[PDB]
């Protein structure tokens, strides 16, 4: 019909970009957590520097942040597998897999955890 010339693989450059994006997302989360921790420290009664130093850093309480922190639910880039950085689970593909770059707004969308065996 109408030619949408989009390849089934990604170029190395694309892959690298994807990786970078993933890393950035992780970093954002990390930063958020750090901020929360330092706020907690300040509330308790410490300085900024002191808070930064502290061995026992506080985990976040809010559900979403906690979930993000868990690597079971939301892996970090170094943890993540090759097969999940550049492919998603498609319920109706051959091999039940599909290049992430096919997913509508893949540059914004985050999607790490494919199914366990698929």
């Amino acid at each position: 019909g109408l030619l949408w010339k989009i390849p089934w693989r990604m170029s190395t450059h694309q892959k690298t970009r994807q990786r970078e994006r993933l890393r950035n997302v992780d970093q954002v989360i990390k930063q958020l957590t750090l901020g929360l921790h330092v706020q907690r420290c300040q509330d308790k009664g410490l300085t900024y520097q002191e808070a930064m130093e502290s061995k026992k850093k506080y985990k976040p309480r809010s559900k979403s942040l906690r979930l993000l922190n868990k690597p079971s639910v939301f892996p970090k880039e170094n943890q993540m597998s090759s097969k999940d950085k550049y492919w998603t689970f498609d319920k109706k593909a051959v091999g039940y897999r599909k290049g992430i770059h096919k997913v509508p707004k893949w540059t914004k969308i985050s999607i790490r955890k494919a199914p366990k065996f698929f």
Binding site: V25, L32, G35, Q42, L65
Partner: protein, 82 residues
């Protein structure tokens, strides 16, 4: 403590809920920088749009004027009137 939150990706193409969230966050345009007090709610909000946003924790916030001043380039000259 304060978050320095930047909109690093355009809202164009992003679902309207997410757009709304971003608007609430006080982020008007791409590349726009906001300094938000750190409380859990704000953090939660940021989490939702994490893929659009670049964040970093800082000691103190900055008023827009201050930010502008910081931005300004060095005019490599000193005028003398005669």
């Amino acid at each position: 403590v304060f978050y320095k939150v930047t909109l690093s990706r355009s809202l164009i193409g992003v679902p309207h809920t997410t757009k709304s969230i971003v608007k609430s966050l006080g982020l008007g345009k791409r590349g726009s920088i906001v300094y938000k007090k750190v409380n859990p709610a704000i953090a939660g909000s940021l989490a939702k749009v994490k893929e659009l946003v670049k964040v970093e924790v800082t000691e103190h916030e900055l008023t827009p004027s201050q930010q502008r001043e910081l931005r300004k380039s060095n005019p490599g000259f000193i005028v003398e009137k005669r």
